Amino acid sequence: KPAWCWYTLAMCGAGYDSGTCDYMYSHCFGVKHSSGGGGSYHC
Numbered sequence: 001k002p003a004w005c006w007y008t009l010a011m012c013g014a015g016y017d018s019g020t021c022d023y024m025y026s027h028c029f030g031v032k033h034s035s036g037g038g039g040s041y042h043c
């Protein structure tokens, strides 16, 4: 994994954050869930 994530422990969401995440929603933990596809950037 990159220098942003760590594992699938799923820290945030369980009080670790203001229930708020970032890199996790980037399909790094497997918690995010959408109807379409997402996971894109305006690079």
Ligand SMILES: *[C@@H]1O[C@H](CO)[C@@H](O)[C@H](O)[C@H]1NC(C)=O
Residues within 6 Å of the ligand: 015, 016, 017, 018, 019
């Ligand atoms: C969550 O963020 C709020 C500010 O938006 C802050 O006041 C609060 O202490 C934070 N809580 C945690 C667990 O990070």
Ligand SMILES: *[C@@H]1O[C@H](CO)[C@@H](O)[C@H](O)[C@H]1NC(C)=O
Residues within 6 Å of the ligand: 041, 043
């Ligand atoms: C596009 O931006 C990404 C970072 O979001 C960067 O890693 C990549 O090198 C950039 N590619 C080009 C062609 O600018």
